[PDB]
Design an enzyme around this catalytic site. Sequence first.
Site, PDB file in Angstrom:
ATOM      1  N   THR A  38     -37.236-115.023  15.476  1.00 28.49           N
ATOM      2  CA  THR A  38     -36.211-115.604  16.333  1.00 28.49           C
ATOM      3  C   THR A  38     -36.249-117.123  16.277  1.00 28.49           C
ATOM      4  OG1 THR A  38     -37.505-115.834  18.353  1.00 28.49           O
ATOM      5  CG2 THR A  38     -36.716-113.635  17.786  1.00 28.49           C
ATOM      6  N   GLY A  85     -38.738-103.920   8.407  1.00 29.92           N
ATOM      7  CA  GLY A  85     -39.741-104.118   7.387  1.00 29.92           C
ATOM      8  C   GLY A  85     -40.176-102.823   6.718  1.00 29.92           C
TER       9      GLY A  85
END
Lengths: 371, 742
Positions: free
Chosen positions: B180, B443
Amino acid sequence: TTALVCDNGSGLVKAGFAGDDAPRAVFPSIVGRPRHQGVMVGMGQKDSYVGDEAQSKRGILTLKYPIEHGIITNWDDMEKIWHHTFYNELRVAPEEHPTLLTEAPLNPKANREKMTQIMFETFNVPAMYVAIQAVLSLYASGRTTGIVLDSGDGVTHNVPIYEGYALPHAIMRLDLAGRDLTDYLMKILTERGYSFVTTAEREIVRDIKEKLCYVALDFENEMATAASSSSLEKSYELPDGQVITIGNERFRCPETLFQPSFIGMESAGIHETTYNSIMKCDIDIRKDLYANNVLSGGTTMYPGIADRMQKEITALAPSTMKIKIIAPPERKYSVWIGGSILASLSTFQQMWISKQEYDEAGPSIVHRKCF
Amino acid sequence: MAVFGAAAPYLRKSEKERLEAQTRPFDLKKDVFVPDDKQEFVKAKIVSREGGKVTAETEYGKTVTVKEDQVMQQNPPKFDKIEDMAMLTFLHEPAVLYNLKDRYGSWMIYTYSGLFCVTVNPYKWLPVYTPEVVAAYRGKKRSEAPPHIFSISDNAYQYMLTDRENQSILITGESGAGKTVNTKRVIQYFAVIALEDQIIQANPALEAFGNAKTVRNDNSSRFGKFIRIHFGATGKLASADIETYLLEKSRVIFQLKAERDYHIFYQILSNKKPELLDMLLITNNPYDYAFISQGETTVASIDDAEELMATDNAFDVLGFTSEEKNSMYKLTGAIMHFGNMKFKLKQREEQAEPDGTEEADKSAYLMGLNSADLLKGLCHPRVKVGNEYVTKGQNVQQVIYATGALAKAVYERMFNWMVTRINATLETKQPRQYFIGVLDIAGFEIFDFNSFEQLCINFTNEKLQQFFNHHMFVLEQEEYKKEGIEWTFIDFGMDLQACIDLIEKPMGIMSILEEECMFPKATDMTFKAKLFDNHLGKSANFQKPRNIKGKPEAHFSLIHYAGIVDYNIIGWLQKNKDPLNETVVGLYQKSSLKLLSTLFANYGKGKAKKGSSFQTVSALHRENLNKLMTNLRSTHPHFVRCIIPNETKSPGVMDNPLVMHQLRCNGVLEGIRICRKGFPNRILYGDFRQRYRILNPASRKGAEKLLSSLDIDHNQYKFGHTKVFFKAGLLGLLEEMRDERL
Ligand SMILES: Nc1ncnc2c1ncn2[C@@H]1O[C@H](COP(=O)(O)OP(=O)(O)O)[C@@H](O)[C@H]1O
């Protein structure tokens, strides 16, 4: 690329794409030709109407069915039917679509041979395949065992399947179906005063049958009920007015399926050929067959036929078995649904008959392991 | 070195300190890398090579013996602390691990690794994010400036401006490892070089509607967020766009043993808003609702009540009204009410009929439909046969699959429309030219009970890694066609595509799964049998499972770029079905709510209309992945790799297993491995002379004389016209002969 599932039937063509939930095109397999002379000059009449149009122009045509009992008897009419199906109902080009076609058990071999010859030469499809109607019903029913009773419009047959293996020596085929029920209903209405003789009135009688007939649970008691009461009579509205009222003819027509002596056949009812196919099958699978009795096709669609057949097969079988009759609401389209499932299966993609294989081995390739 | 303000040390150490650290003894023979038990590879010394016996003296005082087949040299000191991992003299797995280890101990965050940009997050504030370095970088090049994401940001910008094309930033890391804030500083730098507040302001909405607790993370992202930053003709900030991809629907229904559903259901289950509960008939007890109760009920993830409040605040400050938030909340409550429906078989038939009607009534009263009508639409669908409708039959399993697919559909629909509303709020009327997108994706997750969802995730990451690999292939071909030295014309993508063909291709795993959930009486054992019968041995990557340390279970194993993964079959058939119910969808179209917009319209001459029943999560996922690849493959890409140094918030100290895990699952190791097949050590002739001329003291003739008098084979070096290319062994041998020269 996607495949075409054309369940040509005998009395209704059902076509569509593999992977659909239902057929896209459903129309009668009829070819009509004008029988009057034709005076209006310039309107440019054509010479043969095929399909649902022939039912609109029904009043001035002679309607022919190109297929009699499963078997195709008019190959030119059948080519017209297929051409109409491909181009004027689905609007596809068959040079780029595999086509799965459906056939009943125990037909002549020239039927399949000419069918594939036509599909490869006249229509130039890249691949094709011919399947049995009962196997596709059992696909669409979500079973892998069970004795399937597929009552179409020309032919009725039982095909007992267990665990994916079919018992060919126990396959029974009967040539009594909806067309013979329509003829019996014509002949039996004539005794109340109404007469339908033309091929265009055969269609009105078929509509009466579909809309008003049902199977009695007890034939003698329903006969006495009709002889005493009058609560059984319905009225029907012909395409010109003049309502007709039919009484015990409502359940007396489909009773021919259980007493084929009504139309002078010697064989046994559907409830009895089902039981005989079961008793031909091996003793270890009869319980599963009793429990998985599958109905499909348009003639299995009368009200009360499932209850009647359960009563009959239950009275026939030993008293310690669970007789069960599977009758989905989308019975009439079970063969097409199963065909779509099958053609969409990914394992199936190496079981088509390709154009190369055909050009190599002739139309005989149809009966090989590529069945 | 003063141009770098106060951050100059952290950004790059001085040449003086570099040379003062160069002076250090290192034995090239007996200080090689050695396998370890507590870690993978530890710094140690060997006393001697006694046959098959050696003795490693580590720092911890241990003297273990390792086999002569698992030892490999350590990076020389004159090439330690290297900015570009690709330029390392010896490219090993733990070599780069220790490189980044010493670089984060010495507190250098950013590190170049060829076409990547690797960033381990520092846990304390640094002057490296002060606006002075931002403004002062303008005018410096990528090849010379030390690694940092501002570099690649500017390089993407100028690439856009020179080639008149879009660029793509692929930030790759775990949620909660700094992604972020990394993207935040990216968008700050982009604004600086010329709406970030709006991005961060609307972010809590996506954080709610697309994040759920997994085991490796309590705020894991499930959807593929991707922000498009457009520009103008003058390369000035014009507007920002956002798209969502690959949002997993299976979470809304099925949750694993150790994980939760999305955050929103729990945030609503926070009683701090009792008006929501008493207006949605939501009892406080989370065990009450079956769609959710199968996952982890509650965890010490975050202050969920406060997060509910932060989301409500973000909503009220976003363009949409309070009624609209009310409808959102009630719709989610309806999705929650779907799970408790109860169906039974009929008397002497195979038809499903409802026994419990109360939750049906309340869900209809919420949704804006009639209860009897919705029950009829679930038990008796109507399908179109030519020019007529006939009713289809259903049993309990079929109606349950339909209910689940309906819930997943309505949730995903509301989500996509919420993203459209967000983008409409953000939308500025300024003309929007070429953009530079930034991508946030899941991921390459590995576990001990991998399942269908993890297979989907890994398939996506396979497509991405193969894409990057082909990109780097074309980049290396560009380097070669520049240098005028062109060899080894094999591409670097197919070696990975061979594993893709085992998922997407016909008779691959996904096609077999679709066929199996189409077949009549299919079961998990039959699925496994078909997988084996159709792939075992006949394939290259598909192979048996492995049972290690008493792991739970595994039915088969694939190999990916990120290692051998063992997958479990149980539940795949049941969870892949997505039969959408067309009659109930029409009911939604005829609602008395906002629902009629979300379900506005959803389900001759050539029609690819797959039926409602022939629908599979895997197929929808393959389609979405195809279109995401089509959106990315038109833009010149750039890649950002984020690594957590340690699971504890304590800086400095790391965890070597976690570092290796990130490296493997990220594909930095695959990048260096693609390099390891060519010549990765690539140096010009001038510095080559200035460093190796004392071996034969006196440009092609002298270099060639020295090379012939250095006993170098032909195939080991490639002679270039500005740089002459050497391998690991060549660098080691030249180092050794220099050392003996001194
Ligand atoms: N509701 C119904 N009740 C009784 N008979 C019906 C009904 N619907 C259709 N049929 C009969 O089914 C026959 C058509 O069966 P179908 O499944 O189309 O076989 P095919 O496809 O081989 O023609 C028609 O002759 C018609 O008389």
